[PDB]
Amino acid sequence: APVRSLNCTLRDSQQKSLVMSGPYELKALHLQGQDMEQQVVFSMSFVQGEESNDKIPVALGLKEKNLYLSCVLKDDKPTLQLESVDPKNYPKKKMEKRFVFNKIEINNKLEFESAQFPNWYISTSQAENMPVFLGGGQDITDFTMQFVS
Ligand SMILES: COCC(=O)Nc1ccc(O)cc1
C-alpha cells in the first residue's frame, strides 16, 4: 500500500524545540508560547528495514516539503544533512538507507540511530541555538515526540 506517515514534533530531553537554521540545517532552542509556531513539524514515515519491539525504522521529512534528514559522509565521519528529493517519488516505503533512522524507545524517551551508521544518533548541544548533528556524554541523544493533527 502507500507508506504510512504521521505528523509530529520532537523535543530534546532538555525540552529544546527544533527550528530551521537557514535552508539545510536545523537548530535547537528553548521555545515557549507564541514562538512555538517556529518549530519544525515532521512527517515521520514508517519505512522498510530491520525491526524489533523497540527498534522501528523511520524517515524524517519536513511536513509538506521535499526535504528529509539524511546521514552522509563528510570529513570522514557520519554527519546529519537536510536533503532535497523529487516530490513526485517521496515519501516511499523503500527509502534509501541514508534517510533511515532506527527510532528506539529507551526509558520513556526516544533515540534516533542512523541505519547507515550504527551507533551515530541525532544529537543536540546543551547550548542554545546550535545545530542538530549526528553524534557517536554532554551532548543530548534522547527526545520526546508530540503527535500533531
Ligand atoms: C510505538 O511507539 C510507542 C511509544 O510509546 N512511543 C513514544 C512516543 C512519544 C514519546 O515521547 C515517547 C515514546
Curated annotation (Swiss-Prot):
Q: What is the effect of changing residue 63 to E?
A: Suppression of integrin binding. Markedly reduced activity
Q: Where in the cell is it found?
A: Cytoplasm, Cytosol; Secreted; Lysosome; Secreted, Extracellular exosome
Secreted recorded as keyword: yes
Protein name from the UniProt record: Interleukin-1 beta
Add the further remark from the entry: The IL1B production occurs in 2 steps, each being controlled by different stimuli. First, inflammatory signals, such as LPS, stimulate the synthesis and promote the accumulation of cytosolic stores of pro-IL1B (priming). Then additional signals are required for inflammasome assembly, leading to CASP1 activation, pro-IL1B processing and eventually secretion of the active cytokine. IL1B processing and secretion are temporarily associated.
Impact of mutating residue 25 to N?
Requires 2 nucleotide substitutions
**Subunit annotation:** Monomer. In its precursor form, weakly interacts with full-length MEFV; the mature cytokine does not interact at all. Interacts with integrins ITGAV:ITGBV and ITGA5:ITGB1; integrin-binding is required for IL1B signaling. Interacts with cargo receptor TMED10; the interaction is direct and is required for the secretion of IL1B mature form. Interacts with HSP90AB1; the interaction facilitates cargo translocation into the ERGIC. Interacts with HSP90B1; the interaction facilitates cargo translocation into the ERGIC.
Q: Which organism is it from?
A: Homo sapiens
Annotated Gene Ontology cellular components are:
cytosol; extracellular region; extracellular space; lysosome; secretory granule
Q: Does the keyword Secreted apply?
A: yes
- What does the protein in this record do? Potent pro-inflammatory cytokine. Initially discovered as the major endogenous pyrogen, induces prostaglandin synthesis, neutrophil influx and activation, T-cell activation and cytokine production, B-cell activation and antibody production, and fibroblast proliferation and collagen production. Promotes Th17 differentiation of T-cells. Synergizes with IL12/interleukin-12 to induce IFNG synthesis from T-helper 1 (Th1) cells. Plays a role in angiogenesis by inducing VEGF production synergistically with TNF and IL6.
Please specify the portion of the entire protein covered by the chain, as first and last position out of its full length: 117 to 268 of 269
Q: What is the effect of changing residue 117 to C?
A: No effect on binding to IL1R or on IL1B activity. Markedly reduced activity. Markedly reduced activity
* Tissues where the protein occurs: Expressed in activated monocytes/macrophages (at protein level).
Q: How is it modified after translation?
A: Activation of the IL1B precursor involves a CASP1-catalyzed proteolytic cleavage. Processing and secretion are temporarily associated. (Microbial infection) Cleavage by S.pyogenes cysteine protease SpeB promotes its activation independently of CASP1.
What's the domain of life for this entry? Eukaryota
Return the similarity comment: Belongs to the IL-1 family.
Q: Which GO terms describe its biological process?
A: apoptotic process; astrocyte activation; cell-cell signaling; cellular response to interleukin-17; cellular response to lipopolysaccharide; cellular response to mechanical stimulus; cellular response to xenobiotic stimulus; cytokine-mediated signaling pathway
Q: Name one GO molecular function term.
A: protein domain specific binding
